Amino acid sequence: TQQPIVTGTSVISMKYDNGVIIAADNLGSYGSLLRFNGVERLIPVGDNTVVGISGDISDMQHIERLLKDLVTENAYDNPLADAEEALEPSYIFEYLATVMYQRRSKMNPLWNAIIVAGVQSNGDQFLRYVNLLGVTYSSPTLATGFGAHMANPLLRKVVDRESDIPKTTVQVAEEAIVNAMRVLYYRDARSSRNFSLAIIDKNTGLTFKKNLQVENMKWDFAKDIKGYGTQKI
Amino acid sequence: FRNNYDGDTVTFSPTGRLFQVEYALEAIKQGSVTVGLRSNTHAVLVALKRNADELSSYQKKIIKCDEHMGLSLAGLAPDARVLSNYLRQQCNYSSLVFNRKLAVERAGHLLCDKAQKNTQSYGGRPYGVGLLIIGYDKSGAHLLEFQPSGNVTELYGTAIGARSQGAKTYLERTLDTFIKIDGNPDELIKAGVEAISQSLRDESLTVDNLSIAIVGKDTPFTIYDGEAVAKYI
Known part of the structure; x- marks a missing residue:
């Protein structure tokens, strides 16, 4: 049993016609102190999977080390490591889920919420969640922490059910994700303006975008607000 | 000579030989014959079952x-049970933890x-059984030959047991032919039964005497005995 110390907030994602998109800001909070700003919370595994992690940062770094090892280990005595026997998004997820559930079962969790995004070898999109309790689930859109409350509602207006996937383009999807990141920056006190975004396309491959910034913010209407009820000036 | 260096597995002979291992290999040669061969779509095992009395089972x-x-x-059936069981667990682990089928x-x-661990430590003994492993994974059909010495080899076809040399020569001759028997299980089997009967001498393969197994593209590993092998005798 423990308590999280340095933490990462939301991780949001959704799937479109040809792949999946996942994003997360670059902040490492220490309680209410916005302590670290160069924190990458999207972990690429090979060229078909990206693991986004929220929660305790020390545990995130541990999970990072675990993932790099899975890659090394999978390459051992494996002449097809970069082909038919390369790590699949589903293998990576099952592994982490297994670990997450064993750790909670020993009353010593990895204090995180994880989303595994990727494209399988047969083209299928892969999007699944797992957290510190070992709980898992899939949906056309997935978000952790605050994003679950404010991002899913916006992302679900684009893909409300399975049949909406093929009708959704990378452009529409990325636009929706970027808008969601802005909304989170407006109402989540533990969020940052800078974030990373990754796209896993069954055709274009893996596109990892670093140092993005929330832009086109509306603040002007603030000049007209005065007092908290009766004040006029 | 030999007598002084064949007391246990932890002793090298003056010429660099490991007699206990060689004696274990001899138990294989005394075992009943079995054949294995594969195409690009299926893998087949053919075995001659041995009986004690005419009142016993094969x-x-x-x-x-x-x-x-x-x-x-x-060779030693009990050792085959131990080894196959270990393999059952390893296949099991792969599915449960990584949701992956074992290559x-x-x-x-x-x-x-x-097997190697049992050829370098005191007290233990080498396994006294040979194994032919077939399977269909993400890279197609496969056939492996396992020897108690720890040496495992991937082949197109092979045979072990008494008089196994007959079938082995026949297969090494039929190569170009059976390797192309794709999408036609019954043909690959007949090709195997013909290979095994090249090691007969005592009798002729009967219905409660022959045993066949197959795995492939859209064929789960299945075993055929008795009446089910009649159409091949």
């Missing part, structure tokens, strides 16, 4: 390890390493 020689893997034995190549490596 001891099984083929064991299923998973839906996509299996093997045939020659036949990996299964061979695990078997090799397990």
Whole structure:
């Protein structure tokens, strides 16, 4: 049993016609102190999977080390490591889920919420969640922490059910994700303006975008607000 | 000579030989014959079951390890039970933890390493059984040959047991032919039954005497005995 110390907030994602998109800001909070700003919370595994992690940062770094090892280990005595026997998004997820559930079962969790995004070898999109309790689930859109409350509602207006996937383009999807990141920056006190975004396309491959910034913010209407009820000036 | 260096597995002879291992290999040659061969779509095991009296049953020689893997034995049956069981667990672990089917190549490596430990430590003894492993994984059909010495080899076809040399020569001759028997199970089997009967001498393969197993593209590892093998005799 423990308590999280340095933490990462939301991780949001959704799937479109040809792949999946996942994003997360670059902040490492220490309680209410916005302590670290160069924190990458999207972990690429090979060229078909990206693991986004929220929660305790020390545990995130541990999970990072675990993932790099899975890659090394999978390459051992494996002449097809970069082909038919390369790590699949589903293998990576099952592994982490297994670990997450064993750790909670020993009353010593990895204090995180994880989303595994990727494209399988047969083209299928892969999007699944797992957290510190070992709980898992899939949906056309997935978000952790605050994003679950404010991002899913916006992302679900684009893909409300399975049949909406093929009708959704990378452009529409990325636009929706970027808008969601802005909304989170407006109402989540533990969020940052800078974030990373990754796209896993069954055709274009893996596109990892670093140092993005929330832009086109509306603040002007603030000049007209005065007092908290009766004040006029 | 030999007598002084064959007391245990932990002793090298003056010429660099390990006699206990060689004696274990001899138990294989005394075992009943079994054949294995594959195309690009299926893998087949054919075995001659041996009986004690005409009042006894014919001891099984083929064991299923998973839906996509299996093997045939020659030598000490109990050791085959131990080894096949270890393989059942390894296939099991792969599915439960990574949601991945175990590569036949990996299964061979695990078997090799397990056998090796019993050839370098005091007190233990080498396994006294040979194994032919077939399976269909993400890289197609496969056939492996396992020796108690720990040496595992991938072949197009092969045979072990008494008089196994007959079938082995026939297969080494039929190569170009059976390797192309794709999408036609019944043909690959007949090709195998013809190979095994090249090692007969005592009798002729009957209905409660023959044992066949197959795995492939859209064929889970299945075992055929008795009436089910009639159409091949």
